[PDB]
C-alpha cells in the first residue's frame, strides 16, 4: 500500500504492457488513459496548426484560469475556498477537465444542476490532484488478437489503491462552481437557467454547433474510454481494467461510500472474479459499414424537447468515439459491478447503449456459422424487426418472405429506408449486412455479429426451478420442453375467459362489459405480470392498469365504456392476480415468502418485556451462490443547505445531498428486500453461466446487454445448453431457498423473532434434467 517509489510505480504499468502486448501499444494505452485529465501539447499543436470547438474553448479557458490565478494573488486579505485547491494543479488540466466534464454532464436529460455539474468536475480535479505526479512522470516514460490477461503475473505495484475521494462534499462543490464560472466568462459555452438550478443549457451558439456541423467534439472525449489492449484482470477490490498508475483506480463494486466498498476486502469469492474477468477479455471492433451509414443519416413538447437537446450531445459523443477506433483491429471494455451484482461496462461508449451504439459495434473474432449459426442468425434478425411474439418456425419465414428486401438494403440510403422502419433500425441494419455476407461467402465465413436473445421473464423462471412447479416453469417458455408460447398472452385468456364466464353471468362485478366493450388483449395483462417484485399484489396492478390502459383511453375518447375509473382498474387487478396465482404458482408463493421474511429481518424487537430484549433497526444482508455478498442499508439523509451568490448576481442556495450521519429508513428497507434480491439473482445466474460457457464449452467472446447475452452465431447454440445446464446445476446441487431461509433466520432475535414463514412446498417438476433438451 505504497511499498515502491513514485517512479517504480510510473514504471511497472508501462514495462508490463511493453513486455506484454508489445511496445507501440504499451504507449498507446497509457497515452489514451491520460486523456482523461489533460489533452497534451503534442495532440494539440498537430491539431491547431493542421487546420491553418476545440482550439477555441481550451485557449480562452487556460487564460481565465491564469488571469484569475494571480488576480486573487493581489496579496490582499481574503483567500477564496478554491484557491489552494486549484493551485498546484496545472491549469492545462483544469481548463480541460472542466470543458471535458461539463459536456459529459449535459448528456443527462435527467439531472443537470449546478450542484451536480459542479460536484462532477469537483471529483476530477482531485483525482488529478492526487495522481498528478505519478502521472506526469509515467508520461515522461515517453513522449506524449492478443490475450493479455494474466492471473498472477501482475507486478505487485499494479494492485489498485484508494478509489474513494477524500475532499469534503461542500468543498468539492466550490471548486467545481469556480471552474464552472471561469468557463462561462472566458467562453460563453453554458449558462444558468431559472436562476434564483439547470446548468444544462448550451448557449444557442455552441448548441447549433455540435448538432449542425462537421464533428466539433474532435478533441473532447469521454472521461472513460475503451482499451486498445486487454484490460487488467481484477483481484482485490480496486485497480482493475485499466493500467495507468498515474490515475484514479476503479472499484470492483460501485458503492455509496468507501466504507461500503471496504467490506468486500476480506471476502473470498473466485467465481466472481472469474466471471467479471472473462467478460472483460471479449474482443470487439467497430462495424464500419453501419458506421458509414450512421455517419450521414445523423445529419439529414416542452417536456420532450429537453431530451432532444441532450440526446444530441450523446449522439455526437458516441460517433466521435466509434470513428476514433474505427480502424483498430480490436478494442476492449473494463467492467464493474452494482451493489446488487450487475456487471456494468465502465466507458461511456460501450456495447450497452441505444441501438445505434449497439449496431456500431461487433465481436472482433469469428467462427464459421454453418447450418445452425445461419439459423439463429435468422431467428435473431426476426426479433430485430419486431417479429418476436410469434413462434420460431413462422419466425424464420418472415425473413425469407422478405429476402430481396433485406438485400435491397445493399444501398442503405438510396430508398431502402425499410430498415429504419423497424423497431431498432441499426440493431437491424447490421443484421442485413451480416445476412448479405452469408449470401456471398457461404456457410463457411467466420461471421462475428453478437446475437442476443431476451426471455419473457427471469425470476418467474428461477422460482419455478427453485420450487419445482411445472405449469409455470412451462408457461415462461423456458424451463421444460414445449412449443414457445407467451405467458403474457396466457394470462390474458384467463382474464377474459373469467370475465364473460361468471362476471356477466354472475359491487358492479358486471364490469365484464366495460372491459369487453373495450377489449382485453395481451397488451393489457403483461405490464404487471412482469412486475412480480417492486410492483406487487393486485394493489399494484390497479395503478398500473389504471395508469397504462384505462386513463390513456379516456384521453383520446376511446374508453367511453369506463364510466367509473378506479373501480374498473381494481376489478382487473383481482382478475390479473387470480390468473397469475394459477399460471405461475411458485413465483407468487416465493414472493410472499420473501415479503414475509422482509417484515422480520427489518423490524425492531417486539418484546415489550423490557429486558435484554432489543434489536436495532439495522442493515439486512445476503449471499448469492457464486459467493458475492449483498449489503442493503437504506439510510434517511441528514443535510444542511449551502449559500452561493458568486457570479456577481444570481443567489443560489442548493441542498447538500447529505452529510453521511444517517439513521435507517424502515420503509424502504422492508419494501426493498424482495426486488433487490431478485435482481441479485439475475446477477448471479449470468456470472455463473459465463464461467460455465467458457469452461464446459470453451466460448471466448461474450456480449452482455441489459441482461441478455450472446456470442457469435457459431457458438449461439451452445450458450443455450450452457444456460439450461447452469439452472439445473444450481437447484439440484442444493435447496437454495432452504439455505436463504437459514441465512435470514441467522439475522433475527434469539427465538422471539424466529416466527419465520414456512418455506413454500415444492411441486413436481420433471426430473430437472427434463429442463434441458436432454
Amino acid at each position: 500500500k505504497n511499498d515502491f517509489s513514485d517512479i517504480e510505480l510510473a514504471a511497472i504499468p508501462f514495462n508490463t504492457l511493453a513486455d506484454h502486448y508489445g511496445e507501440r501499444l504499451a504507449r498507446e494505452q497509457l497515452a489514451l488513459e491520460h486523456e482523461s485529465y489533460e489533452m497534451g501539447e503534442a495532440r494539440f499543436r498537430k491539431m491547431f496548426e493542421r487546420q491553418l470547438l476545440i482550439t477555441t474553448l481550451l485557449p480562452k479557458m487556460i487564460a481565465r484560469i491564469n488571469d484569475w490565478f494571480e488576480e486573487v494573488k493581489a496579496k490582499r486579505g481574503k483567500r477564496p475556498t478554491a484557491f489552494q485547491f486549484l493551485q498546484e494543479i496545472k491549469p492545462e488540466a483544469v481548463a480541460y477537465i472542466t470543458i471535458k466534464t461539463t459536456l459529459a454532464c449535459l448528456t443527462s436529460a435527467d439531472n443537470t444542476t449546478v450542484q451536480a455539474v459542479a460536484s462532477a468536475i469537483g471529483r476530477a480535479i482531485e483525482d488529478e490532484a492526487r495522481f498528478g505526479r505519478i502521472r506526469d512522470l509515467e508520461a515522461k516514460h515517453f513522449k506524449k488478437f492478443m490475450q493479455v490477461v494474466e492471473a498472477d503475473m501482475l507486478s505487485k505495484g499494479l494492485l489498485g489503491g484508494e478509489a474513494w475521494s477524500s475532499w469534503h462534499k461542500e468543498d468539492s462543490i466550490h471548486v467545481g462552481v469556480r471552474c464552472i464560472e471561469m468557463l462561462i466568462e472566458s467562453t460563453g459555452m453554458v449558462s444558468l437557467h431559472r436562476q434564483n438550478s439547470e446548468t444544462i443549457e448550451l448557449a444557442p451558439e455552441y448548441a447549433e454547433a455540435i448538432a449542425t456541423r462537421a464533428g466539433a467534439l474532435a478533441g473532447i472525449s469521454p472521461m472513460f474510454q475503451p482499451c486498445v489492449v486487454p484490460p487488467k484482470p481484477w483481484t482485490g477490490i480496486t485497480g482493475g481494467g485499466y493500467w495507468a498508475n498515474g490515475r484514479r483506480p476503479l472499484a470492483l463494486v460501485r458503492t455509496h461510500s468507501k466504507k461500503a466498498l471496504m467490506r468486500y476486502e476480506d471476502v473470498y469469492m473466485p467465481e466472481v472474479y472469474k466471471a467479471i474477468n472473462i467478460a472483460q477479455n471479449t474482443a470487439w471492433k467497430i462495424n464500419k459499414k453501419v458506421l458509414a451509414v450512421a455517419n450521414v443519416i445523423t445529419k439529414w413538447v416542452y417536456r420532450k424537447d429537453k431530451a432532444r437537446k441532450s440526446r444530441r450531445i450523446s449522439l455526437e459523443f458516441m460517433l466521435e468515439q466509434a470513428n476514433k477506433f474505427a480502424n483498430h483491429k480490436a478494442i476492449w471494455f473494463p467492467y464493474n459491478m452494482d451493489w446488487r451484482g450487475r456487471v456494468y461496462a465502465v466507458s461511456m461508449f460501450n456495447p450497452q447503449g441505444n441501438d445505434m451504439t449497439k449496431g456500431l459495434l461487433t465481436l472482433a473474432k469469428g467462427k464459421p456459422i454453418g447450418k445452425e449459426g445461419y439459423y439463429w442468425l435468422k431467428i435473431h434478425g426476426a426479433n430485430c424487426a419486431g417479429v418476436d411474439k410469434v413462434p420460431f418456425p413462422e419466425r424464420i419465414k418472415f425473413i425469407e418472405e422478405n429476402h430481396e428486401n433485406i438485400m435491397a438494403c445493399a444501398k442503405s440510403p438510396l430508398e431502402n429506408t425499410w430498415w429504419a422502419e423497424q423497431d431498432s433500425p441499426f440493431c437491424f441494419l447490421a443484421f442485413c449486412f451480416e445476412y448479405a455476407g452469408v449470401q456471398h461467402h457461404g456457410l463457411s465465413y467466420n461471421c462475428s455479429l453478437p446475437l442476443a436473445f431476451d426471455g419473457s421473464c427471469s425470476g418467474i423462471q428461477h422460482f419455478s426451478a427453485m420450487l419445482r412447479d411445472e405449469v409455470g416453469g412451462r408457461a415462461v417458455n423456458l424451463l421444460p420442453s414445449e412449443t414457445v408460447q407467451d405467458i403474457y398472452g396466457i394470462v390474458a385468456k384467463k382474464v377474459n375467459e373469467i370475465l364473460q364466464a361468471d362476471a356477466i353471468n354472475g359491487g358492479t362485478k358486471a364490469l365484464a362489459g366495460q372491459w369487453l366493450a373495450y377489449g382485453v388483449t395481451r397488451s393489457v395483462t403483461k405490464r404487471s405480470v412482469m412486475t412480480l417484485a417492486y410492483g406487487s399484489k393486485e394493489f399494484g396492478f390497479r395503478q398500473q392498469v389504471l395508469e397504462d390502459t384505462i386513463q390513456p383511453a379516456i384521453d383520446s375518447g376511446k374508453g367511453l365504456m369506463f364510466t367509473q375509473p378506479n373501480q374498473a382498474a381494481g376489478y382487473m387487478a383481482k382478475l390479473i392476480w387470480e390468473s397469475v396465482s394459477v399460471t405461475v404458482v411458485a413465483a407468487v408463493e416465493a414472493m410472499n415468502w420473501l415479503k414475509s421474511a422482509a417484515k422480520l429481518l427489518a423490524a425492531e424487537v417486539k418484546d415489550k418485556k423490557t429486558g435484554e430484549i432489543l434489536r436495532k433497526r439495522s442493515a439486512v444482508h445476503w449471499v448469492t451462490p457464486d459467493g458475492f455478498p449483498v449489503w442493503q442499508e437504506y439510510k434517511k439523509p441528514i443535510q444542511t443547505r449551502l449559500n452561493l451568490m458568486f457570479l456577481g448576481q444570481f443567489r443560489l442556495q442548493p441542498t447538500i445531498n447529505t452529510n453521511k450521519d444517517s439513521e435507517i429508513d424502515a420503509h424502504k428497507q422492508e419494501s426493498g428486500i424482495a426486488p433487490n434480491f431478485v435482481h441479485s439473482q439475475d446477477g448471479s445466474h449470468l456470472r455463473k453461466t459465463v464461467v460455465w460457457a467458457h469452461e464446459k464449452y470453451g466460448i471466448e467472446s461474450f456480449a452482455l446487454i441489459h441482461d441478455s447475452f450472446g456470442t457469435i452465431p457459431a457458438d449461439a447454440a451452445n450458450l443455450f445448453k450452457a444456460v439450461r445446464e447452469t439452472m439445473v446445476d444450481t437447484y439440484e446441487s442444493s435447496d437454495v431457498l432452504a439455505d436463504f431461509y437459514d441465512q435470514f433466520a441467522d439475522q433475527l432475535h434469539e427465538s422471539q423473532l424466529d416466527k419465520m414463514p414456512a418455506l413454500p412446498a415444492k411441486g413436481n417438476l420433471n426430473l430437472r434434467d427434463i429442463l434441458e433438451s436432454d
Binding site: 471476502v267 473470498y268 435484554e612 449471499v623 455478498p629 439455505d739 439475522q747
Partner: protein
C-alpha cells in the same frame, strides 16, 4: 454462508471479553447483531463461550477475522461471555464451568498450531479485555480480576 480468505498462518490465540453483565446470556447470535451494527458481514470472533459453558463456533477456524487489530491476519480470537460488573467496570466474573471450556479449547488449539502463542487483548490494547490476568489463570487455576497478565 459468506466466506473469508485464509490466514497464511496462525501465530497467536487471543482472549477478549464482551462488556456484558452476568444477567445477559448472550451468544454468537447476539454478538453478531452487535457486529452487523458495527458494520460487518459476520461475527469477528472464531469461538465464543456462553455463560453456560457452551462453545459456539463463529467464523471458520482458519479465517482472517475481525477481533484483534493489526493482528487479524494471523490469529484466533475467543470472546468470553461476561466481563463487566453490574454497572461498573471490568470484573473477572466468568463461570468456573466456562473456564474449563476455555481450558480444553486452548490446549487443543495450542497443540494443533505448534508455535502458536496464547495472548490477551489488554496486552496490546489500551482496553480491559479479557479483563483478567490470564497468565495467572493459565499457570495457576487462580482467576483474578485485573488488566495485566
Amino acid at each position: 454462508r459468506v466466506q473469508f480468505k485464509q490466514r497464511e498462518s496462525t501465530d497467536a490465540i487471543f482472549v477478549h471479553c464482551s462488556a456484558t453483565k452476568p444477567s445477559q446470556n448472550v451468544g454468537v447470535r447476539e454478538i453478531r447483531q452487535w457486529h452487523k451494527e458495527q458494520g460487518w458481514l459476520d461475527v469477528g470472533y472464531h469461538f465464543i463461550i456462553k455463560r453456560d459453558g457452551t462453545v459456539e463456533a463463529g467464523r471458520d477456524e482458519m479465517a482472517v477475522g475481525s477481533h484483534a487489530k493489526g493482528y487479524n491476519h494471523n490469529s484466533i480470537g475467543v470472546c468470553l461471555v461476561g466481563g463487566i460488573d453490574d454497572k461498573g467496570k471490568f470484573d473477572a466474573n466468568f463461570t468456573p464451568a466456562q473456564m474449563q471450556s476455555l481450558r480444553s479449547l486452548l490446549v487443543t488449539l495450542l497443540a494443533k498450531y505448534e508455535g502458536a502463542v496464547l495472548r490477551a487483548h489488554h496486552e496490546v490494547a489500551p482496553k480491559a479485555c479479557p479483563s483478567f490476568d490470564l497468565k495467572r489463570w493459565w499457570e495457576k487455576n487462580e482467576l483474578v480480576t485485573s488488566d495485566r497478565g
